[PDB]
Structures are given as C-alpha cells and as structure tokens.
Point group: D2
Chain length 207, copies 4
C-alpha cells in the first residue's frame, strides 16, 4: 500500500496547573471541577470522557488545542481547508516555490493504471519545466503557480481544539471518503491516539 | 476575468422593515433606544456602530454570492474561515514578448492536461482521480456565504494594495453587489 | 414561559428558487449532476445529505429568531457560539407555593431597589448587578440552518432544562414552517 | 474587581522552537522562506504580520485563562464567540461566595447603594440556601441569584483572538469591571508573549 498522506505533531496544549501535566489530564480536570457534585466523577479517565462525548458536554474537549503538520496534495488540501473550525498555515504564495516534483496519483486495468502514471509524469515534468522557465524569465511565483497541477505536494499546519479533531478524524476515516484523505486522517488519528489515550479508548480507536 | 452574482440575502419579516440593511439599522435602534445616535441618518448610525465595534447588528444579516474564479485565487478565498462555501462535487462533476511566451506556453500546457483529463474520463477513471492533473488556473465557481460584518472585512482586506490582482478583481465584483444591497453601509465606509 | 418569533430568513434572488429551503434543495442537486441520488424527493435528498454529513448546503441558508426567555436560560443559549446574538444595550435599555411566594417577594424587592437606583441617576450597567437570573430577556438569535438543526435537536432532547425545552420547541415550530422538507428529513 | 490566572498554553515540539510565541515567529519564517522581513526580530516580524493581516501564524498558538468575575460581566465575555468557555455545572455546582456590592456611577449615595446591595444580596443567599434545604434543584435555585454573583470561567482562545479581546476590552468607554478583567488578562498575555506585547506596545 502507497502512503499518500503524512502528519506530524507540531504543538499541543500544556497545563500550568499543579498536578495536571497533559492536555488530556486538563480535559479530565475540566470535567471533574465544573461538575463536582456528580457521581460520574468517580469513573475511569476514558469512561468519564466517554460519558461527556455521549452527553454532548463538548466544552471540556475545547480547553485543549493541537497543531499537526500535514504533507499531502493541493487537490486534497482543497477538502481539508473546508473544515472551518480549524486554523491553517501554508507557504507564502509569493515567497515560496515548489521544490518536490509532483508524484503520480493512483486511479479507481493494470496497463490502464501504468498509462495514467506515465501520462501524469509526462505532464508534471512539462509543468515543472515551464515553472522554472517562467521563474528564470522573472515571472513572480504567484503568477507561475497557476500551471502547477492539483497533485502538487503540499505541507500545511492544521490547528484545532480536541473536539474539532475528534469529528474531523471520525469523518475522514469513515467508509467512502477519498483514499488520499483517509491516509491523511489515519496519519492524524495515529498522532491523536498517542497524545489522547483515554479519548482514543472512549471512542474505541486502536493503533 | 473574475466575476460575482448575488444568489441570496436576508429578508426580514418584521412589519415595516423590508431589506436586510433596514434590519441592521432597526437592530441598532431597538437594542439602544435611549441612545442619542438613533437620531442620526441610516449611514450615520452604522458608521458609528462600525467605529465602536458593535459588530453584532451586522451579524443579523447574511449574503450568498456566486464567485467565478480560478483554483489559485480560491486557495486564498477559502482561507476566510468565517464564510461558508459551496463548490461542485469532486466525484459527480466535470470541467512584453515574455508575456506572449507565458500565454502561448500556458495554452499549450493547458490543452495537454485537458486532453489527458478527457482521455482519463473515457477510459473510466473516476473524476476525483482525474482532477489531480488540472492546473491551479482551472476555472471554478463557488458560493461564498457569510454575515455582513464578514463581507465588510473580506472586501476591505482583498481590495487593499498588495493583494494579488486577480483577487482584487473578484473582491471589486463583490464590492459592487455589496454597494447595491447595502448603500447606507457603503456610504458609512466611504466606498 | 419561553417563546420565539421569526425575525428574518434568507431569500434567494435566482430564478426558479424562491424560498431558503429551495436554495438548499437547489444546492444539494446542482452539487451532484451525475449522481442518481439527485432523483430522490426534496426531503429524501436532504435526508441523504444530513446522513452523509454534506453540511455546507445547510450553510447557504440563514435564519434569525427573537427569543423571549430569561437570563438563566440565556446562560445556556449564549453558549451555542456558532450563533450570532443581538441583545438590548447594557447601557441604553431598562427592564412549590413557598418557592413561587418567596420568589415574588424577592423579585418585587429587586425592582424597588432597581427603580430607585435609576430614579437616583445610577448608570443602567450598574443597576443590572442587582438583577436576578429570572429577569426576562428578549434576544435575537441568528445562525445558519445547519446550526439551527443541531441546536433544536440538542435542546428538545430529554435531560435539558424544561424552560430551555419550551424555548427550543418554540424554535422547532418556526423551523418546521420554513423548512418542511428538512423537518421531514429529520422526522420532526 | 476581577482577576485572571493562566490555565494552559500551547507547547511546541519542533526543534529550536520551545514556546508558543517562538512557534508563532517560526510559523511565519517557515511559511515565507524567500522573504527579507524574516531577518527582523521576533517583535519586528510579528509587528509586520499584525499590520499586514497575516493572522494565521497567530492562530497556531492557544491559551486558556481562568477568570474570576461577576455573572453580569461573564454575560459580556461569553459574546466573544471565537473563544471557548468552561463553566461550573448549572445542576452539580453550588454558589458558595456571597455576591459583593458593585460600585455605582452616573459618598452618601454610594453608601446607600452598597448597603442596599448587601441587604438584597444576603436576602437572596438565605432564600437560595433554604430552597436547596427544601430540595429545590440547583438549576431551579439559581434563578433568584443576582447578576453580581461571582463566577469562575475558563476562557480558551487562539493568540489572534486574545490580541483583539485585550485591545477591545482595555479600550476607552468599556465597563470598569470589564477593563479590570481585560487588564488581568493583558498582564498574563504580556508575560507569555513579550515580543507580541512589544509589537503592540503593551507593558
Ligand atoms: C498580506 C497577507 C499575507 C498572508 N500570508 C500568508 C502566508 O504566508 N501563509 C498562509 O498560510 N496564509 C497567509 N495569509 C492568509 C491569512 O493569515 C488569513 O488566514 C486569511 O487572510 C484569512 O483571514 P481571516 O482568518 O481574517 O478570515 P475572515 O473570515 O475574513 O475573518 C475571520 C473573522 O475575523 C473578523 N475580522 C477580521 N478583520 C476584522 C476587523 N478589522 N474587525 C473586526 N472583525 C474582523 C471577521 O469579521 C470574521 O468574523 C495572508 C494574508 C494576507 C492578507
Ligand atoms: C460525503 C461528503 C460529501 C460532500 N460533498 C460536497 C459537495 O459536493 N460540495 C461541497 O462544497 N462540499 C461538499 N462536502 C463538504 C462538506 O459540506 C463540509 O462543508 C466539510 O466537510 C466541512 O465540514 P464541517 O463544516 O462540519 O467542518 P468542521 O470544521 O470539521 O466542523 C465544524 C464544526 O462542527 C463541529 N461538529 C462537526 N461534527 C460534529 C458532531 N457530529 N457532533 C458535534 N459537533 C460536531 C466541529 O466540532 C466543528 O466545531 C462534502 C462532505 C462529505 C463528508
Ligand atoms: C448535558 C449538557 C451538559 C453541559 N454541561 C456543561 C458544564 O458543566 N459546563 C459548561 O461550561 N458547559 C456545559 N455544556 C455546554 C456544552 O459544553 C457546549 O458549550 C454548549 O452546549 C454549546 O455547544 P456547541 O459548541 O456545540 O454550540 P453550537 O453553536 O450548537 O455548535 C457549534 C458548531 O458545532 C456543530 N455541530 C454540533 N453538533 C453537530 C452534529 N451533531 N453534527 C454536525 N455538526 C454539529 C454545529 O452545527 C455548530 O456549527 C453542557 C451541555 C450539555 C448538552
Ligand atoms: C461599544 C460596544 C457596544 C456594544 N453594544 C451592544 C448592544 O447594544 N447589544 C448587543 O447585543 N451587543 C453589543 N456589543 C457586543 C458586540 O457587538 C459583540 O457581539 C461583542 O463585542 C463580541 O465581539 P466579536 O463578535 O468581535 O467577538 P470576538 O470573538 O472577539 O471576535 C470574533 C473574531 O473576529 C476577529 N476580530 C475582531 N477584531 C478584529 C480585528 N481588528 N482584526 C482581525 N480580526 C478581528 C477576532 O480575532 C475573532 O476571530 C457591543 C460591544 C461594544 C464593544
Ligand atoms: C501579489 O500577490 C499575492 C500577495 C500576497 C499573498 C499573501 C497571501 C495571501 O493574501 C493568502 O491569502 C494566502 C493563502 C494561502 C497561502 C499563502 C497566502 C499568501 O501568501 C498572495 C499573493
Ligand atoms: C471517492 O472519493 C471522494 C468521495 C466523496 C467526495 C465527496 C466530497 C467531499 O467528501 C468533500 O469534502 C468536498 C469538499 C469540497 C468540494 C467537493 C467535495 C466532495 O465532493 C470527494 C471524493
Ligand atoms: C435539568 O436541567 C439542566 C440540565 C443540564 C444542564 C447542563 C448544562 C447545560 O445544558 C448548559 O448549557 C450550561 C452552560 C453554562 C454552564 C453550565 C451548563 C450546564 O451545566 C443545566 C441544567
Ligand atoms: C461602561 O459600561 C458599558 C458600556 C458599553 C457596553 C456596550 C456593550 C458591550 O460592550 C457588550 O458586550 C454587550 C453584550 C450584551 C448587551 C449589551 C452590551 C453592551 O451594551 C456595556 C457596558
């Protein structure tokens, strides 16, 4: 299997409160402090948080925030951007040029797929050739980028609260979503499981 | 060239108040009845509410505009996270002398990708997979939906100097619609 | 008892599209031309879009409602941050049997002190500080149809405070009148 | 009349990047590698980005603050819709702290107001306490509680959002108890973000 989606942790929330060391301990803390005269406080870390998700007490999961660096394609980025709750950071359209050569994209026919690879590579090299030819002649990076295909490799910072991350990963890992995006979301999920064990457990998410 | 068409706007049902703008003025008056600012003109009130950052009255009205642009300018557009967008389905929908050189070489490249794009479709390749070869300049049409507060700030940002020319043109075509539906706010902002 | 009144809704300007629900239905069909699901009822198509989390169509429409509630219920209401709200200026605008009895006795005394403070020329923003959570409040609640679906679904479900249930139910009725096909796709 | 206390702030993992502010300055530099502006100080780069509306690098950092205020002010604060909030349960929490008297604006008239506030406030407390004793639900018992009732809230938001909240709420005209609260936030903000404070001229 091809890996057409990568993610890396950039930052995550860190509590300054005594005894509470991680963002997930803060989500746990937020829940028990706000609702002290509740029997549900006595439950396990995962169990408490599961109850909150089940009951829609979302705000505790918004006391935490995580930035992940995503490596994907412009055509996929197009979908990612539509997740309005998140905040993003991308390369300057004027002070940054495309380094990586666009890779061939798989289709949804053994000699039909091979053709699609060869033909893409052909067109990509042609766009890349003309991209640098335009740069050499003085054309601004913002004008030159218009010839770059949708397969253009891209790195973006995707920043959002934990609640938002829960729903983005739930959606983008569900049956039917584009593969170059399920790869991305699963790459995100791996980082999430790590940082949030008790949430991963309450949502039933395995490595 | 980049263009915009009005698709929908807020229309109040409170008797006497007909347009979305009238409602914004109404909302600023009814919430502040003992305020001397209610005496002034429609534009006077709103210019005042804008200066003092009373944004909520501008949040009682919403507007959808259809933008005809390119994927590269839309790369910017989609970044104004306060707006709601509606684009076509990825799966169910199909598409001096150096300056002369840049155009000829663009058309040549663009004809090739479009050919291969069509070649891929006839072969049975899914549209979402076929899109991947299309340049950042593939023409796009999107619905941009947001509150009047949001539009004021998008237009103010995207029409300022430094903005990519092709986005300025888009923003200016949004400004013309905004000036038509909200003339008292255009007068208030000096547009 | 909490009530709601429709202030304003989205109205399309495009030919063949007259109501805000038609614009949603329009957007949901124009999205998928090659799609076969495009040949379902107005409500069937929308039921599919809700199911498949194709929310953006429900964000082409926007609605305002005037809520007649209390400050104690507004403390829940104001927490639905996807909504925009408009309230009377804090500066330029002025306001079982044992429980009901002792409550009136306190509330009436609260007004004597409130009215005296304004008679004395105290600023309204200051005179609000003596006011109880029970104090009535008329607010404007504006949000996209997506945000309205989720607020009503949450605030009508068992467990929420009755006073908030009444408020949300009063919002549900307006929604049902403006969006029958969405109300039907949601089984309301 | 209102205090703030830091609860949590974003913590980067990138090498050479140790703080939320350092990450903001980093996000701006990695983003535009072929730009001269990057060779200014952390404060300079950030002043440039603020002035030119490059807001997204300010949306890579997040802060949570516990605010100690009145229900009357909380009501204003809750309107800052880009922020996320965490409050005590309306059901499983009880108001211990007796509401204090608020200062009126337009000594003997001021005294009248404080005395009358203390009277009405205590009266509401005894009735609150008795309704609880009499088995009335904590959510139904809070309706007799006044707008002066002390409240502790978690206010969580991106650094961009905090810049504008501090600026608006410390600006001329703002209600006094709100300025004080906005100032107690300004104090924490400056400590965590000195080069942003420097670019905005906050000290
Ligand atoms: C000169 C420039 C350089 C940029 N460089 C980069 C880059 O290198 N990399 C990158 O990834 N991105 C870059 N961006 C994009 C940028 O940081 C934003 O992400 C983009 O401009 C979207 O803005 P926004 O979040 O303000 O969205 P909007 O949706 O327009 O604003 C969000 C909210 O903020 C409010 N708001 C905005 N201004 C005001 C105001 N004055 N008063 C009150 N409310 C206001 C709006 O009304 C709205 O509710 C750049 C933008 C510009 C203009
Ligand atoms: C199958 C599918 C088909 C699509 N087809 C089209 C098309 O043809 N054209 C088009 O323009 N777009 C399409 N889209 C994009 C879609 O309309 C959304 O706009 C995009 O998915 C962003 O989702 P969102 O706005 O919920 O984003 P997010 O930012 O992920 O979510 C917004 C907010 O909602 C909250 N939230 C989301 N889900 C939940 C939940 N279950 N419970 C509690 N809170 C929640 C989040 O926490 C967040 O604050 C499609 C999407 C899907 C999944
Ligand atoms: C039982 C209960 C107990 C609570 N206890 C506390 C407490 O002790 N302390 C406290 O501070 N707060 C509490 N809250 C409040 C809660 O944490 C939220 O702050 C509040 O209800 C507002 O929710 P929201 O952010 O989902 O707002 P909204 O404005 O309704 O949501 C923001 C966005 O999420 C999207 N969304 C939501 N649900 C869905 C969905 N199902 N599918 C797709 N999109 C969706 C919306 O459409 C909207 O765009 C409680 C809430 C409940 C229901
Ligand atoms: C003088 C005054 C009078 C008011 N009167 C009333 C009244 O009579 N009735 C009533 O109901 N409400 C009133 N309000 C409240 C008001 O209209 C807003 O609802 C409240 O101030 C919250 O602001 P916000 O939506 O900007 O929220 P925020 O969460 O602070 O802002 C939302 C977004 O806008 C962005 N933003 C804001 N300013 C800028 C900027 N300069 N540049 C870039 N981004 C920016 C933020 O960064 C954030 O992402 C008043 C407020 C003031 C200050
Ligand atoms: C003169 O042409 C220009 C001028 C400035 C920019 C600045 C800029 C934006 O405004 C923007 O939204 C953006 C969105 C996503 C990545 C980068 C940028 C980005 O770098 C892009 C083209
Ligand atoms: C087979 O792979 C697929 C499957 C579903 C889709 C559906 C879809 C999304 O999910 C999406 O976010 C999106 C975002 C913006 C425009 C269109 C779409 C869009 O059409 C796209 C490719
Ligand atoms: C039985 O009536 C109830 C039922 C549930 C609640 C739960 C709850 C909300 O729903 C809510 O928005 C809220 C908003 C701000 C603080 C606390 C709460 C909060 O605690 C409060 C009273
Ligand atoms: C000096 O006292 C003041 C001065 C001005 C205001 C203005 C103001 C806000 O700023 C605010 O969020 C607000 C929220 C809800 C209703 C009214 C207001 C409102 O009127 C409030 C108190």
């Amino acid at each position: 299997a091809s890996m057409t989606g990568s993610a890396k942790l950039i930052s995550v929330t860190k509590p300054v409160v005594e005894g509470v060391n991680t963002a997930e301990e803060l989500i746990a803390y937020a829940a028990r402090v706000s609702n002290p005269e509740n029997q549900i406080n006595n439950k396990t870390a995962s169990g408490l948080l599961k109850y909150c998700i089940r009951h829609k007490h979302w705000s505790i999961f918004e006391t935490a925030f995580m930035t992940l660096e995503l490596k994907t394609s412009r055509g996929i980025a197009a979908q990612v951007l539509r997740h309005r709750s998140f905040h993003f950071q991308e390369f300057s359209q004027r002070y940054a040029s495309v380094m990586e050569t666009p890779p061939p994209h798989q289709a949804r026919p053994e000699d039909d797929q091979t053709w699609w690879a060869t033909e893409q590579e052909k067109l990509y090299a042609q766009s890349m050739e003309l991209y640098n030819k335009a740069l050499e002649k003085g054309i601004a990076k913002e004008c030159a980028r218009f010839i770059l295909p949708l397969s253009t490799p891209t790195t973006i910072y995707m920043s959002g609260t934990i609640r938002d991350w829960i729903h983005y990963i739930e959606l983008r890992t569900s049956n039917g979503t584009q593969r170059e995006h399920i790869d991305l979301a699963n790459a995100c999920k791996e980082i999430f499981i790590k940082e949030f064990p008790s949430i991963a457990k309450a949502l039933d998410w395995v490595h």
